[PDB]
Amino acid sequence: ELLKPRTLADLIRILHELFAGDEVNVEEVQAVLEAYESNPAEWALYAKFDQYRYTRNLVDQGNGKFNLMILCWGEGHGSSIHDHTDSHCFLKLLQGNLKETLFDWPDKKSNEMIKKSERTLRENQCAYINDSIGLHRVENVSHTEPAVSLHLYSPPFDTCHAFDQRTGHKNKVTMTFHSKFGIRTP
């Protein structure tokens, strides 16, 4: 039974219920994430920005079933084109706007990667990606407003690939956290 999460903590409780089994109902997870209304006071603890690039801040480990994290994007900060290591990946905007660009998986031949499409994700909107859909890049193109997003990955993964837009070549990347449970990482 899906009910509206009244707070971030309630959202987390609901997600634990949704991921108690060995499969995932993607539509239900997306619906509950969209239903949570961002309340900056509830996630201020996690919203730790860096001057130079976006930060990943771990919020919950899902009893091993998922990682829930908050990403903080300075003005002009963006990501690489990346995959999601055969996991489900949900993204919900908590503050500001992000541009999401979708790319096709590259062919064996070296070539410019062309965009399938792009969209602007606005506050409280929740998107979903997985490797079968394609690759994406996420960017805060704003010059005046930092952005903050909530990401859920299941199963958890700590490695993925980044793709060079000019060739499609991929490189393995290990993700890092800037903080965990509100505590900065050494």
Annotated binding-site residue numbers for Fe cation: 82, 84, 136
- Binding-site annotation, residues: 82, 84, 136
Instruction: Name the E strands within the chain.
Output: 55-60, 67-73, 81-82, 88-95, 98-103, 115-121, 126-129, 135-139, 147-154, 159-163, 170-174, 179-180, 183-184
**In angstroms, rounded to a whole number, what is the distance separating the alpha carbons of residues 35 and 55?**
24
**In angstroms, rounded to a whole number, what is the distance separating the alpha carbons of residues 20 and 48?**
30
Tokens of 121: 């994700």
CB 148 within 8 A of CB 69: no
CB 84 within 8 A of CB 160: yes
Helix (H, G, I), strand (E, B) or coil at 42: helix
Instruction: Work out the angle between the directed axes of helices 8-18 and 26-35 (0-180°, nearest 10).
Output: 170
